RNA sequence: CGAUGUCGGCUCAUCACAUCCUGGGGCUGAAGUAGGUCCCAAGGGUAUGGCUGUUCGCCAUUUAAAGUGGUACGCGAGCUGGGUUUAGAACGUCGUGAGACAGUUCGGUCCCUAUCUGCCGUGGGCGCUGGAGAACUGAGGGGGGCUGCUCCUAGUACGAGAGGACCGGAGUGGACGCAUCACUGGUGUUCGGGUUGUCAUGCCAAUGGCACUGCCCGGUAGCUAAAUGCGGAAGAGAUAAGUGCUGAAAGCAUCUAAGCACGAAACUUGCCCCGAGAUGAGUUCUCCCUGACCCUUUAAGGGUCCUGAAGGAACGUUGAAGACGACGACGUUGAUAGGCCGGGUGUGUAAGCGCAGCGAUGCGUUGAGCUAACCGGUACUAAUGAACCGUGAGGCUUAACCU
RNA sequence: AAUUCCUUGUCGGGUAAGUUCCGACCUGCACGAAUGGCGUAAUGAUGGCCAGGCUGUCUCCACCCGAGACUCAGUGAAAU
RNA sequence: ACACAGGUGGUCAGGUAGAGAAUACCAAGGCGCUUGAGAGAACUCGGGUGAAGGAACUAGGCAAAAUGGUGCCGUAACUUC
RNA sequence: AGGACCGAACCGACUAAUGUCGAAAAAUUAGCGGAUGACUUGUGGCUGGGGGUGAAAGGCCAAUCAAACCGGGAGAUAGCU
């Protein structure tokens, strides 16, 4: 459950380390983000050598939440600490070549094939 | 109810290996990948067990690469192939929710070995 | 909306509510009959009945649990020796509620909650 | 077509072979004997009157006991009515069973909802709670403004206010059927139906076919 | 929260209509004593349903 | 002017159409996608934030879109008091001065228990004409009506290419609304456990009181959402703007004059809900009551004696029903509530004794003991036999029917 | 600027976005030297602003324990 | 104005924990605040917990939460030292 | 040593909530500030109406103050209601 002003943990080594969601995309008057929705975020802190630095405003997609995604039977795969994978504005295509931590099967939507095919688990 | 209880016991799987909360449990779960019904594994520590007959469930906490995963499981589900206990853990408290904040050597528990 | 809830509040805090039955059950155990408020009588059945069924089989563990509740020695002495083994045949429903007019000071229904005994 | 009277008996779940769980509601539907067939000569409209369950032969009344004797069937609890579609005709004495719902796919479960009691305007009409600080005095969950001023000079009829929430008679539709048992007299429908465990449930096929 | 015009005997009279007291007149007769007691309540002498239960 | 509280915000809105979106069209300097503008249309929808007291506005990011307005520039006996518009104070400024400045800045008690109308709920009385118990019909009234994207059609039409549809169908989302706890959970001061201080139970032990439940770890039933289902419709009738056919007046021409046809989320039905107090009081079905008397102002009359049926109410046990009434269940020919039994769940290896250890403590007995509201049972307790209200076959006229 | 009307001056910082805040440029509507000028450690129930912590302040409320509200019994007001 | 949650100077001032006349539980000693009985709606008041998020609220972090003790290690800019 | 530091009694009264025909004609509750000093307090004095006192607000002087109260000028006067 990610609404605005939520601090996240950067899953990819694009350069960011701590980001904040400025607005949930995918509909009007939307409450919060979730599973694998697209969100427009800002970076609150980046590493000195990353591709991106502090102050940028670009898209992202959640991969791990503490709210947890629900399997079709009643199983949840809750995690510890919210995460996201950075993406370019116009092109979905992520920025980080490596992904730290697991992702979930619900993220598979062909545009995130690049992401799941760069996952260390699940 | 004579009806509700009847509708449950006919759907409950007969062989569920018993285990107290805290054991190192490995669970093989059926996973569906497009056109393949693969059987991926999941081994971790049980931190909670809910007994509700047919609606019974249990949780398993695995400290994966980087950050930890807390995955629950439906006991009487067709998705849960097998359940195997590795290390019979010894704790004297029902739910190990004090373990969600412990890490490293602080998280480890005692073996039963009675 | 209290759907399917149980346990009358009796216009008292948690402490006082528990504490009054501990004192009230003592009066019922000691005199075999009391005169209280009608709603207070109906709630006393939920406390005494266990304490009597608890006193069926006399032991070392039971004489402490019957002391953990009621906090008295004369109550535990009267139970387990005279009251306790006396209800041998009867299974539950040891007490009896009988309504009696109203309290002549505030108009509250009164009730004589007694045990099915008193053949002295 | 027609509907059948039932009783909600808790909720459970079914596990499909692939493992997908589906929330189902156990609806007992026993022998729905038909007491009165309504004719267009007496009524003008076409319908049937059924009953189910069984009451006590000391609690049932003389006026209604004669009604059952007029039909011949046993004195069941309650009496309901279902509309006919002109392509059917039932007989008095016919015991309509749950087997009629074998071919159906979507039904409209109808039942008396749970009595929420005299609820507040927040709990009832989904109002938004005002600020619980910053100086707010004696007003955190009230309805607030209920009108304009002098020009209207009155509260418009239909204004959402505090009233009896619940214990109404709602109709949940398009619930997909799952299993129809004739032996145990059951009916499994996906989703949650109205009413508490142990109330009536008029069950009829979907009008939105 | 203050009245504009005072009501009358007509208005004050209508409001007291439903607030009229009840009449029971269903006094029971005791099985043993044969006295008048309320329904389900004990008699003035402690007798109830025939059996003397208060022993007083 | 023997008082109409002033801006803005919160809350809650309802209405107009001069329409921001979605729906239907005409024209295009409309090839396509996408637009401009005009007409028809008010069913539904119609941002979140930064700065500002601001309405406003600029900015960032969205959205199908972020409409303009009325409603005392809606809304203080609903809230706020940040601004203006008290007394203190100071700055620039004006004045010799007290002081003054929609110039500025810091500070500054915002009253009310609702008789009436209105409105949301919910009963009592009576009527509906013999009384009662039910089941409906349905006049009429209310709710609901939003939409994105993806894919198929088809990368076809179109078009130098780049790009890239119409109509129609399917899938899956957001917001909103209704319902419900099976899963995920929160709560659960009535259940179990741990533990600090302390006082009491004579003391060890074991328990209990108090300290915000002492402080916390859990957690049943309910409740509930962040949880899970479901919904908006299709269609039909009659039309709007528009498109028409035939076709005169006016030999041609013309959608219109006669006549016939298509035509929108709008209107009326279709989907659910309330509903015969709809005094126009309707319909259907079943049930119960067919004793005599005197008077007479001989009136649809009065009063008494003999009978009081169906049924209602009352009292009780009460309830996933409820402020109180009301509504549902049950009242021994009993499963209504409590208790009891068993089970379930929770909690976690009681107590005692035995055993090892200098001791805290650990070990065995023992996953025992204790387990509130839950499930299935069992009359042990409490629902007493009765009395109360309600009557004795139901008016006048006329018509058609049986004698 | 507690002073600047024009003004949300302009530039830079901070924020994704800053009519307030911080450092400057002076074009001082109408600062300025004991109606004191400019600094200033410490101090402040002081004025404005930022960040960590922290949370039901809010997103959007949900449940629960008590005191009234509600019914019965006694006594019994007021503004108008 | 009252048998009014207010104001009224000095004195003695136990036990355990504790620096303490703080604070918590008790002693000596004195009390249950002169309306009660049910029910367990909205709403108000005083509180408790809270998923995910963490000032997005608002004029403003007002309020709540959080921090809190003893000993020890350690402690910047600036400074009237 | 200290108009020193933290902190009860004590004195004070910044925020917030309740209260607003209140329990109270400025209090309650939860937090605040000073707390060896220009501190605080008991007791008894002394200063008085254009006067007093005032670490100065036009505050305070018996719930009344940009000139108190009681009585008397006085039935002031009132182009006003």
Swiss-Prot record, chain A:
Keywords: Ribonucleoprotein, Ribosomal protein, RNA-binding, rRNA-binding. One of its GO terms (biological process) is cytoplasmic translation. SMART domains: Ribosomal_L14. This is Large ribosomal subunit protein uL14. GO terms for cellular component: cytoplasm; cytosol; cytosolic large ribosomal subunit. GO terms for molecular function: large ribosomal subunit rRNA binding; structural constituent of ribosome. HAMAP family: Ribosomal_uL14. Belongs to the universal ribosomal protein uL14 family. Part of the 50S ribosomal subunit. Forms a cluster with proteins L3 and L19. Forms two bridges to the 30S subunit in the 70S ribosome, contacting the 16S rRNA. In pre-50S ribosomal subunits interacts with RsfS, which may inhibit association with the 30S subunit.
Curated annotation (Swiss-Prot), chain B:
This protein is located at the 30S-50S ribosomal subunit interface and may play a role in the structure and function of the aminoacyl-tRNA binding site. This is Large ribosomal subunit protein bL19. GO terms for cellular component: cytoplasm; cytosol; cytosolic large ribosomal subunit. Part of the 50S ribosomal subunit. Contacts L14. Forms two bridges to the 30S subunit in the 70S ribosome, contacting the 16S rRNA. In pre-50S ribosomal subunits interacts with RsfS, which may inhibit association with the 30S subunit. The lineage of its organism: Bacteria, Pseudomonadati, Pseudomonadota, Gammaproteobacteria, Enterobacterales. The keyword Metal-binding does not apply. GO terms for molecular function: large ribosomal subunit rRNA binding; structural constituent of ribosome. Induction: Part of the rpsP-rimM-trmD-rplS operon. GO terms for biological process: cytoplasmic translation; ribosomal large subunit assembly. Belongs to the bacterial ribosomal protein bL19 family. Keywords: Ribonucleoprotein, Ribosomal protein, RNA-binding, rRNA-binding. The keyword Ribonucleoprotein applies. InterPro entries: Ribosomal_bL19 (IPR001857), Ribosomal_bL19_CS (IPR018257), Ribosomal_bL19_sf (IPR038657), Translation_prot_SH3-like_sf (IPR008991).
Curated annotation (Swiss-Prot), chain C:
Keywords: Ribonucleoprotein, Ribosomal protein. GO terms for molecular function: structural constituent of ribosome. InterPro entries: Ribosomal_bL17 (IPR000456), Ribosomal_bL17_CS (IPR047859), Ribosomal_bL17_sf (IPR036373). GO terms for biological process: cytoplasmic translation; ribosomal large subunit assembly. One of its GO terms (cellular component) is cytosol. It holds the Pfam family Ribosomal_L17. Part of the 50S ribosomal subunit. Contacts protein L32. Requires L15 for assembly into the 50S subunit. HAMAP family: Ribosomal_bL17. This is Large ribosomal subunit protein bL17. It comes from Escherichia coli (strain K12).
Swiss-Prot record, chain D:
GO terms for cellular component: cytoplasm; cytosol; cytosolic large ribosomal subunit. One of its GO terms (molecular function) is structural constituent of ribosome. It comes from the Bacteria. InterPro entries: Ribosomal_uL3, Ribosomal_uL3_bac/org-type, Ribosomal_uL3_CS, Transl_B-barrel_sf. The modification N6-succinyllysine is found at residue 38. The keyword Nucleotide-binding does not apply. The modification N5-methylglutamine is found at residue 150. GO terms for biological process: cytoplasmic translation; ribosomal large subunit assembly. Keywords: Methylation, Ribonucleoprotein, Ribosomal protein, RNA-binding, rRNA-binding. Pfam families: Ribosomal_L3 (PF00297). One of two assembly initiator proteins, it binds directly near the 3'-end of the 23S rRNA, where it nucleates assembly of the 50S subunit. Part of the 50S ribosomal subunit. Forms a cluster with proteins L14 and L19. In pull-down experiments interacts with CedA. Belongs to the universal ribosomal protein uL3 family. This is Large ribosomal subunit protein uL3. It comes from Escherichia coli (strain K12). The gene is rplC.
